[PDB]
């Protein structure tokens, strides 16, 4: 039930998220683009600084008036093929170097922590106040610096499949925002898009997103979703923790199979007023795919001995999820104190460094960082016994992978539907049917991906916003309108890209998309979007 206090909490969370995104963008620009800073910051340092900034900002709001507040989604920096889960800790730099010695240079940016020109950096972070969660995610491009131009500007725009992915993600984000804002004014929906008397449907969402992706020659990564957000139920760990009820549209390998052949989420809903929606879209480029293939995900482990592949990434996830349905008394006093600290976080993923007493740092000092690492050692000692008794689980690091359909069709599975992963610790991904019609399980699909010689990794671009459908009493101007709590032209400003693809204006869906854009730009007789502003610091 939307109300004044709920709206204020959502707005405050969105403002803090926007300010944090501006802070990380400024730090990355000053380290790699402006190059005025003496020292280039690395990815774990940027993540730690982001989390400290978020905590210091959130300290001043709703103090002793809200039971639970903090970081909802820990800061994540995903580069290219990595599509999520990359939040490495500061005590793992040498571990990453030792683990990935003797490998290829494909994941060199993630291994070293230093960004390189031509990289797609996806920054994701979220903030919750009293269970009301606002999350933002934005893709940006790293550019080389021109030496002759008086002002710091890129030498040239991004070109190719990465540009295709960024353009597809940006345009799909804007189009979905406009379509969802059209739910409050059902009379402004174009006839070509759908019924004038009809509302907004998950089928319409799916066909618009798929039309944009197919027009830009990109695939929707199976992590993407457009869903509804409630209190403490924001999909902060969607593939891990099961939810009783789901109202949204998701994309999977099963959906790819259905398109090619043309608790459970279903695209058979109607968007209602007074609701909060999360839109996370990941587009993977298909530039190097000479055939028709399937987009899926690969999990990264920390075992260098499982294979001989030189292009393999070996890493350890940095974020953990607490399972409050499981209880087991630990033998270690360190483990018991760590679990006491973990239970204070709540139902959101957390980092080990977030549990330290030093964090967040007030005066950033080398001695403070040393005390933080000293705490991290004992935290890892406690976490070893915590995870071994299934009290907490890891959020996996994932890479987008492309598998051709001919290999899948030629393959044989003697078990079919019956097979599943019996050694999988997590329940939800262990029992999975990525291809229900072909009867191919997740373990069989992983076998196919490993056995295929032409299974490649696709660069991914991400855009994720949070919106609220404010009614007449909820909104200020006495008419319903869309409030974008995170993202917009100020924080999520698109990078300099150029792509050779475009929407074809001869399609009914494309014409509907263009009419949505025009009606959104019409600020008098069109749609009304209010964008949350990042607060000043200095």
């Amino acid at each position: 039930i939307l109300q004044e206090s709920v709206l204020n909490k959502y707005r405050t969370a969105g403002q803090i998220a926007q300010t944090a995104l501006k802070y990380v963008t400024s730090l990355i620009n000053d380290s790699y683009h402006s190059k005025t800073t003496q020292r280039q910051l690395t990815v774990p340092e940027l993540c730690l600084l982001t989390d400290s900034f978020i905590l210091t900002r959130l300290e001043q709001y709703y103090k002793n008036k809200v039971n639970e507040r903090g970081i909802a989604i820990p800061t994540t920096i995903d580069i290219d093929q990595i599509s999520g889960g990359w939040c490495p800790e500061i005590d793992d730099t040498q571990n990453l170097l030792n683990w990935n010695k003797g490998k290829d240079s494909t994941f060199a940016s993630s291994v070293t922590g230093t960004l390189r020109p031509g990289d797609l950096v996806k920054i994701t972070l979220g903030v919750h106040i009293d269970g009301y969660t606002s999350e933002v995610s934005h893709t940006m491009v790293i550019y080389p610096v021109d030496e002759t131009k008086p002002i710091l500007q890129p030498t040239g725009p991004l070109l190719g499949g990465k540009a295709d992915a960024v353009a597809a993600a940006h345009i799909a984000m804007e189009t979905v925002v406009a379509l969802l804002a059209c739910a409050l004014t059902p009379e402004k929906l174009p006839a070509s898009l759908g019924g004038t008397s009809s509302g907004i449907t998950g089928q319409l969402i799916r066909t618009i997103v798929d039309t944009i992706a197919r027009s830009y020659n990109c695939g929707v990564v199976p992590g993407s979703r457009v869903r509804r957000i409630r209190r403490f139920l924001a999909g902060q760990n969607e593939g891990i923790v099961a939810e009783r009820e789901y109202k949204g549209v998701v994309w999977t390998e099963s959906h790819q199979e259905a398109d090619l052949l043309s608790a459970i989420p279903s695209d058979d809903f109607v968007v209602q007023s007074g609701e909060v929606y999360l839109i996370d879209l990941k587009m993977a480029s298909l530039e190097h795919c000479t055939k028709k293939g399937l987009v899926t995900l690969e999990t990264v482990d920390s075992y260098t001995g499982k294979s001989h592949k030189a292009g393999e990434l070996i890493a350890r996830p940095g974020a953990y999820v607490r399972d409050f349905a499981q209880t087991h008394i630990l033998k270690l006093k360190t483990s018991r104190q760590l679990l006491t600290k973990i239970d204070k976080q709540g139902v959101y993923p957390f980092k080990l460094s977030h549990l330290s007493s030093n964090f967040p740092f007030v005066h950033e000092n080398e001695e403070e960082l040393q005390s933080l690492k000293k705490d991290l050692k004992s935290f890892r000692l406690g976490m070893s016994e915590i995870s071994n008794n299934y009290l907490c689980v890891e959020s996996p690091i994932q890479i987008a992978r492309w598998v051709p359909w001919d290999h899948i069709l030629k393959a044989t599975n003697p078990n079919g539907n019956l097979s599943y992963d019996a050694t999988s610790t997590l329940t939800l991904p262990g029992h999975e049917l990525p291809l229900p019609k072909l009867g191919v399980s997740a373990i069989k699909l992983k076998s196919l991906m490993n056995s295929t010689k032409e299974s490649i990794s696709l660069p991914v671009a991400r855009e994720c916003n949070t919106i609220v459908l404010c009614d007449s009493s909820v909104s200020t101007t006495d008419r319903p309108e869309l409030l974008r709590l995170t993202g917009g032209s100020k924080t999520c400003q698109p990078s300099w890209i150029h792509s050779q693809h475009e929407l074809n204006p001869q399609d009914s869906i494309v014409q509907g998309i263009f009419q949505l854009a025009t009606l959104a730009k019409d600020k008098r007789f069109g749609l009304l979007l209010k964008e949350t502003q990042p607060m000043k610091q200095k």
Binding site: T25, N29, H33, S34, M140, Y143, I151, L152, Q153, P154, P157, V166, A167, H170, L260, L261, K291, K292, W405, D406, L409, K437, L438, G439, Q493, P494, S495, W496, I497, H498, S499, Q500, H501, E502
Partner: peptide, 26 residues
Amino acid sequence: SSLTLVKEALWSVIDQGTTLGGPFFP
């Protein structure tokens, strides 16, 4: 066979531009 029919259908079905942003660092 339903699996045979699905595999046959899958085999039968598989067998300017745009510019965003500008010369600046946001």
